[model samples]
Target: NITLPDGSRREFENPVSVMEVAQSIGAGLAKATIAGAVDGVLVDASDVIDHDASLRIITAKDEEGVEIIRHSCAHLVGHAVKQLYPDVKMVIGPVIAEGFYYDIYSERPFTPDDMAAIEKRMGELIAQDYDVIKKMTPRAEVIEIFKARGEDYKLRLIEDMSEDIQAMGMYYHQEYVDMCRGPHVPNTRFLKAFKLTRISGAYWRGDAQNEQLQRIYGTAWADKKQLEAYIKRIEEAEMRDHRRIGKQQDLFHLQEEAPGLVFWHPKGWALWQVVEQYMRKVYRNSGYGEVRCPQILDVSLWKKSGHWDNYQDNMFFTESEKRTYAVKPMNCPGHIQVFNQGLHSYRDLPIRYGEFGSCHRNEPSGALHGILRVRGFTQDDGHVFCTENQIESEVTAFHQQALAVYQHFGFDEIQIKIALRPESRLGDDATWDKAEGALRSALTACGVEWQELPGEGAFYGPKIEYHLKDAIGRTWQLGTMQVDFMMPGRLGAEYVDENSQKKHPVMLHRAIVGSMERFLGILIEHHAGQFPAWLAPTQVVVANITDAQADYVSGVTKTLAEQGFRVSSDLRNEKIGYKIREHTLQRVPYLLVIGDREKENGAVAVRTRSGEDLGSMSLQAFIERLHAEGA
Candidate 1:
């Protein structure tokens, strides 16, 4: 009996393959089938199923089916490369976000012309519509097969597997063979919507100490429309890059002397201050008491918190007065130190503390990417010291608050995931169960479903991660709510219980905008340097049409400045249209042009950055409109 996802059962006298089962159901399904899932394990459509098991036919409509296409596309890259360059040793090909890359060792570097030729050959191979065959070969035979082809890297990969493994899956693409634990496409027709993107130098095994290898990258999709959409999204992201937009707007800069650190210009600081103040209000209204912590602490504190053991390589250590200290990489331990200072009872169990904490980490220079990935940063870190019974309510409340904040910033497409415990963790199984369970129960209580990722959580606990999808379809992880049962007790934080006994408090580490610099960088890219009126550095620019209206322009600038707007005046010896165009390029939200007619009429002609003219309006009318937009 074979069980289907909809609870239907099929009886077979003998064992049958997944494709046979699909053909039994419908010819349309069999034709569309890319793969199948037996008892939740993904397998090729040709794989046989003998025992009683549940089955789900995979199609191009499924996300897993698309992933199989990408994986198969990586194998096709190997096929094309070997055909073009006979001696190039293919190291490994793996699927990454939105694409796949093949790393190879070559006697000479692969050039752009070679890449174009390889891509051309891949297209020709796809046009042939040849079948891809899978063979489960003996381990010894697999080794000999690769050895015959001089694929030393394949042998090395096989050696990394367990010795008890007697056999491996070898896939053949009409003489080009590759090994993988995969559910790849059955035919080259599934690989038609793929394109070679770029080439880069990558280290073997991702270690700088290892030899460099050439990596060719490509992206694949299930159909032509999806491929075109992905290409357009990539182009939009390139134009919205924060580094380029930041330089053009004179918002921030990075130099060789201070790599991974931002030099916030006057306008950039103006925008940052607005976000900081907004967060301060979030803290005040949410029962979080604002606090400050030192930027540097003794090395002993890090050891006590388990950061030194699990995160030593990423920490920036310093020596002062013959005592070793570490620049703060996270704010949790310091907040726990504050929690340990005061004696408390169960009535005050849910104590919340918030900080705009400064931190520094010894990030590798190769990992730096403008302001997004930085060595020095600040976080709007908030910690809640709560009893075990309060975990669900606290987490639920935090989830609601975080969603509202993201909505305020125009991020409606937010993906939530619960990251489970890591292998290199501080706590034991029981502690992890309770921590992970609390977050699960909390999200369920809020009627929210989330994706669970194993082995991706913090060292001390599990976490709820909020990833925001930007305008260009890229996702950024910006918010998190992590539950920790280890840090409080390790740092000696205790509270008096209802029964008059001292017990360790469960800690919740939460942050909406994780890193201030990174959030601003995302904001810059998301808006494409066209900030909302409330967050814009220069909200309004008053420009004079001619010298006769110079006094009116200055007066308008002063009036807006006095009313707490970020206002400026362009009294330069230039035409009004020229000044307006310049400030509009700078992304000023509103431009007030003072002409002799408007000055004599005691009004200003307003033009928006989008070139919309609001005609002549009184100063009060404009202020009310700006205030309506939350200015």
Candidate 2:
């Protein structure tokens, strides 16, 4: 008798494969099974089991099953590329967050036209319905096979395999084979909804000194609907690109001379100031004491914090007065310096320090994009120093604060992801277990739906990442909260406890909006430039229906300006319809029109951003309505 996932018992005459067992259960289930878990180990459904072991069939509804499908799609990509470009030397292909990518050493980079051609070939191969066969070959034989094919890259990779291991496992289609340890889909036809997206240059094994290889990036989904939705989201993202919209709206620009930086125009600067002011208000109300740290610090400070060793490649270093100084790449080390300034008692235990931290990282040129990935940006960064007992409460408060800020920016669908200890982590196993448990318990108490992202946390501690799903269904990781008990000890940050003993304070690192420039860019794209009244750069544009009402339009603008609205007067010698259309395109939330009757009766015709005319109303009534709607 064998136990199933539903805890039911079944007796079989002899050993059988999991696929046959699934078929015995139900035909629908047999069709749905992609893989199976035998006594807790994920394996191919074709694997024969002789013992009475429990089984759990993985279906499309299971998360693990989806990952298996994506992994299989990566192999399909490899097979298609090898069939088309025989000279291309294949490297490792792995599954990433959303999809998968394969690194290949070809004579030339793959182009968009190449992607289309390769996709067509992939379709043909999938139509052939080739069965994937897995086999084990001697490591030396594997090297010889790849070397004979002129695949020196694969030969080098095979040499790096475990020296004690004698055999190398691989997967194969008809005439195409690659070294891999995988539980792929049953066959190539499982990859029905997949496409190669783009290609870029990458260093061999991510080492800059090694040979550069072309990396092909792509995405795969379960069905056609999911693929179409992903493609549409990508289109929407291109439409909302800040660089393009900034140019069209005359908001900002980046020049080659100042790569990875931004030059904000008057309108863009105005919008930035509004966002900063809003953050300042939030800081003040949340009991945070704001401060600033120097842009350059001595290299010794960074060395003490362990960043100079690991992050020196990304730091901008300079020498001054016979000493080296490094520009700040992160805010945590600086916040620690502030915390260690003076002695304090338990009364000052929970000290929250906020900073608009300006950071600079020497990112690779190929990685530079618009405001999304920049070299210079400001973080809405804050750190809370508290005792171990205060961790849960402080974390809860930070989560609440982050949610409030997100809601203010019109983000309703927020997702929380908890990343536990990574492979190269600082703390001990017990410490990491405790920290992960604390964060998970806090999220549960707050009633947030969160899933664990294995092996994605910071080196110092476990963290909770907050993602906001935008209108087009793209999830952006905007806010983060992390619990760090290790950094404080390394930096020697201590406070006197109630028992009069020097205890290392726990550091809680957090960011609500992440970076000001990036968040502002997201906001622009989120609303499609039609900003809400309170957040708009120019809320109202007062227009004159005729030259006779020009003075009345100016008067109306002055009245609105006095009430703290961003008002402008458009009294140009253009057609009234043309003026309305221009301001409407500018995305002004309210447009006040002045005509002969309006001027005579001390009234204005108000039109909303959506083109709903409010007819004629007194200036005071208009002001009240504007405030109400803006609020």
Candidate 3:
């Protein structure tokens, strides 16, 4: 007797195949069954079970079933390739965030024509509905079989395995067989929907020193609807790509000479300043004193701060005459020197210092992404110096503060993670235990339910990371608070305690926006460049409907500017419709139009970028309206 996921028991007289179990249930169920879970472990339906266990048949409706289809499609493509090309050697096909990609090694690269042919063959093979067969063979025989087939990549993979690897599980697509750790569908019929998207290059095992190989990327789904939806999403994502939007909006530009640096146009700078000054207000109202730090410092300073020894690889180093210097990759170490300047009493224990400091990192040339991942950036960084007892309150305060900031920035969904100490760490186990305990206690007391992640912490401490979901359902880590157990003592930072003795201050490193450039990039994509009124580079554009009201439009623009709005006057000798169309595509939040009737009536007509006509209103009323929505 075995129980299904629905909690019903089915009795069988003898050993039964999974397909038979599904057939006993219903014809529709048997047709739908792609794989089964035996006691929560996935298995192919073709495999048999003789003993009682909990089983749940998977289909297109299940999340794991979609993954099963993708995996099965990978195998189907491998089979299709072998049937047609016969000489191609395939390596690894693994699932990624978007879909699965198969890495292969071949003398001639697969062209677009080859990919089309492979995709067509996959479609034909699935239509034929060949039954997949699984076989077990000794590891030595498996290795020798692949060796004889001239599949050096597969041979090298299994030859390095231990002698204890007694047998290999092989699945066959009709006549073509491959070894994989899989619980694939029953047959080619289950792999009904898939697309060979694109191809790229990769190194063998991701090491540049190893031989280069070609990667074929694909997207597979369980049904036609899902496949079309996924393709549409890909097309939408390409349209919403920040690089393309940035150029269209004319906010920023990147060049090959300076791979990771951004040249912000006037509009982009205005947008950045709005975010920066808003953060500045957050600091001022949150009991933080802003500070500025040097861009470059002597190498000894980083050595004292432990950054020189630990982060040497990604640090940008230079020398002047006989002395060595390094650009600052972080603002924490520089902020520490400022803290160590004056001795403090217990009353001033929780001294919070904030900085909008510029930094540089030696990021790999190939890994430099447009603005998102860069060599130069700035941080809205802050640190709190306090005693052990103050840690909880500080963390609690920051927790609420980060949420408010995310809310203000239009990121509503948030996830918190308490990342524990990593393997390569600086502190002793006792110190680590205390640090982790402090963070745990702080989050719990603050009423934040967070997941504890193992081995994701920094070398010196654990951290609470704030990840917010964007408009497209993608999560980005924007805020963090880490409690360091080593920096203060290493940097000779201390404060006077109640007993009149000096003690090392516990340092809490926090960054609300990890990098201003990266955060702006996220905002650009999240809002699709249609920024809110408060953050829009040009909050209002007052245009004359005809040259008759040009003077009135200029006066209105000047009045709005004097009234503390970013307003522009467009008196171009063009049609009002053309000007509105131009500004709407530029994503201006509001367009105020002027005409002869409005100048005589002392009013200006307002139309939002979203195509809402707010009707005409007096200039003072318009200012009041914008003020209400501005922040």
Highest TM-score against the true fold, candidate: 3
Model 1 clash pairs are: none
Residue-level error in angstroms, candidate 1, position 4: 46
Clashing pairs in 3: none
TM-score of each: 0.64, 0.63, 0.66
lDDT of 2 by residue, 1-631 (tens): 6679788978887888888898999998887777789898888766668988898998766777767777877777778888788878888788886678888888788888888887788778878877777677888788788888788878877778778889866677788887676676767656788777878888787999988888888777778788789888877766777777788777888889988888988888888888888888888888788989898988888888866677789889999989999999888888888889989788988999999988998888788888888999998899999887787888888889889999988899988999988889897788787788888878889988898999999888889999998876788989988889888988989999889999988898888999888898888888877678889888888999889999878878887888887888999999999988888888888888889899999988899889898999999998888778763
- Model 2 CA RMSD to the hidden true structure, in angstroms: 11.9
lDDT of 3 by residue, 217-296 (tens): 89988777888999998877776678988888888998988879899998888889999999999999888999998988
Model 2 has an lDDT value of 0.83
User: Comparing candidate 1 with candidate 2, which one achieves the higher TM-score?
Assistant: 1
Over the stretch 406-432, how does candidate 1's per-residue lDDT look in tens digits?
999999998899999898888779878
Tell me how many clashing residue pairs each candidate has: 0, 0, 0
Relative to the unseen true structure, what is the C-alpha lDDT of residue 73 in candidate 1, on a scale of 0 to 100? Answer: 93
TM-score of 1: 0.64
* Rank list by TM-score: 3, 1, 2
Candidate 3, run of 10 with poorest lDDT: 303-312
Residue 221 in model 1: lDDT: 90
Local distance difference test, candidate 3? 0.86
